[PDB]
């Protein structure tokens, strides 16, 4: 109360300061990346990361999908990004698939948080025809030492995946997370379960790899220690989750 | 004569702007011998639309001879429903500086609608008074008479940006606070100071001030003989003061 | 007053018991003629953010 300021005028600077706006970054993928015609759903998966982060809220961020490369319009999704977080995902279910435009096909996402309006143009994708077979995946494994082993010996896996059909040439990656159980843990559930929450995505449980445009063979490598003696078991399982 | 998307339609004959000049919507214009260009030619169009671009034509004739083979379309402009917004920001590196030392005032202009996308740039020439010196122009004509003999100087919008950068150099003379003020004012050829506006009814002036510092000396001292005797030499104190 | 640094003494008692034997000298001050006035400058390195 009884302070006394020095200054009289409140001071103000010779400069200011520019506070810009905060631009956004989207990439979209297709989970199927060769859809049949009503063989299935496709569910358009659009990640958007922000310029900066958030200040004590949650950004709501707005996808239109008004055109599907094909002709058809369905709703807008609303997504939500953490206060800390940067990044938000949106998510477009569509089934009508029809191989009667000729192709390649590609898409137009808009996203606005503040009305403005960012595009991102997708890259292209192929639709088989009705009555064909969605392409599955296999997939085989290799341990370099090999058995038998001991406690704490190293120990490689290596997991090759392949595709019944080849990823289409005209260009879209396929994310796929390679997540490795050893047999020695609490044995998870089934596959539903096997999506552990994981700190940071190289780690020694999960590996993200990416199948090229033109390939169909990849392959995904774990080296792990193990704690527990154990006769006549210790099955290592692995899952691909497409993310 | 000419036609800028103001009413009717063009004259799509050229007779038909041959008469159109030889009548009251025609204006004449004078070339003196051996000189390259002609006296300045005004119109006045009324608009009383709004919305996006538009493009008119001009025709032009000598002796009946008209210039341009259909008619000269003139650059791409718009109308608009409101008067366009400029706000201004200013900045200085130098915050303190001492006399007769330079300065640099730096602005910073944001214009409320873009400058047309096919159109021109946006040619506006600012006045910059630093606040030390003269009582400074009060009027749009005085802020225009100030040309770029060192205190005015011309920017330019480019087409589809609302952005403009600007600076000067002041270079104070006496201490103390030295605020500054700017005008802003279109910088087009036909650039009149009798009937000039201004884009900014109150004149910027930027919220700081400029402190100007007392010079301070350094002073050095030698003598001539370094070993001076008695009775014999005067002493020569030679001072020298930077 | 005006001019030089000066000082003050400051003594303080607990039942006539004396604290510190002479005194206890206040730090030094200056006695000025005229309110002093700040001259502030001030910078931004990141000047677009
Ligand atoms: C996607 O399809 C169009 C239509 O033929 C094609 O012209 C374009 O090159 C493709 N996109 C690529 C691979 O750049
Ligand atoms: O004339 C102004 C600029 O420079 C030239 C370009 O075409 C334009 O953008
Ligand atoms: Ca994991």
Request: glycine residues 8%.
């Amino acid at each position: 109360a009884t302070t006394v300021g020095f200054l009289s005028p409140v001071y103000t600077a010779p400069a200011f300061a520019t506070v810009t706006a905060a631009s956004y970054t989207i990439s979209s993928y297709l989970n199927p990346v060769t859809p049949v015609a009503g063989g299935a759903a496709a569910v358009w998966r659009i990640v958007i990361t922000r310029n900066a982060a958030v200040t004590a809220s949650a950004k709501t961020l707005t996808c239109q999908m008004p055109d599907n490369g094909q002709g058809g319009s369905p709703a807008d999704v609303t997504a939500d990004i953490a206060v800390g977080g940067t990044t938000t995902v949106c998510v477009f279910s569509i089934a009508g698939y029809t191989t009667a435009t000729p192709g390649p096909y590609f898409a137009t996402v808009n996203v606005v948080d503040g009305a403005v309006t960012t595009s991102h143009i997708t890259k292209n994708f192929t639709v088989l025809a009705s009555g064909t077979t969605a392409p599955t995946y296999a997939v085989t494994s290799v341990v370099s030492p090999a058995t038998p082993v001991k406690v704490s010996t190293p120990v490689t896996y290596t997991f090759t995946i392949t595709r019944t059909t080849a990823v289409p040439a005209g260009g879209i990656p396929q994310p796929i997370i390679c997540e490795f159980f050893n047999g020695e843990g609490t044995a998870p559930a089934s596959a539903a379960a096997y999506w552990r929450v994981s700190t940071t995505i190289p780690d020694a449980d999960t590996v993200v790899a990416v199948m090229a445009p033109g390939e169909t063979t990849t392959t995904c490598t774990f080296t792990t220690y193990y704690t527990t003696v154990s006769a006549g078991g210790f099955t290592a399982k692995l899952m691909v989750f497409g993310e | 004569a000419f036609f800028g998307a103001d009413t009717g339609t063009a004259p799509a004959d050229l007779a038909a702007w041959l008469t159109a000049a030889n009548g009251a919507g025609g204006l004449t214009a004078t070339i003196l011998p051996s000189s390259i260009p002609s006296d300045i030619i005004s119109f006045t169009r009324t608009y009383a639309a709004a919305a996006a671009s538009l493009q008119g034509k001009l025709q032009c004739f000598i002796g009946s001879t008209p210039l341009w083979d259909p008619y000269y379309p003139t650059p791409v402009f718009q109308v608009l429903a409101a008067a366009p917004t400029y706000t201004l920001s200013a900045s200085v590196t130098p915050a303190v500086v001492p006399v007769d030392t330079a300065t640099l005032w730096t602005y910073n202009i944001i214009r409320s609608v873009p400058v047309p996308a096919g159109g021109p740039s946006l040619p506006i020439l600012c006045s910059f008074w630093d606040g030390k010196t003269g009582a400074a122009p009060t009027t749009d004509a005085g802020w225009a008479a100030l040309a770029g003999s060192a205190n005015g100087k011309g920017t330019s919008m480019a087409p589809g940006s609302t952005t403009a950068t600007c600076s000067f150099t002041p270079s104070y003379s006496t201490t103390g606070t030295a605020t500054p003020t700017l005008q802003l004012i279109q910088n087009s050829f036909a650039l009149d100071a009798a009937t000039t506006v201004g884009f900014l009814s109150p004149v910027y002036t930027a919220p700081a001030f400029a402190t100007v510092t007392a010079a301070s000396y350094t002073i050095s001292s030698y003598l001539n003989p370094v070993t001076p005797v008695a009775g014999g030499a005067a002493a020569v104190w030679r001072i020298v003061i930077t």
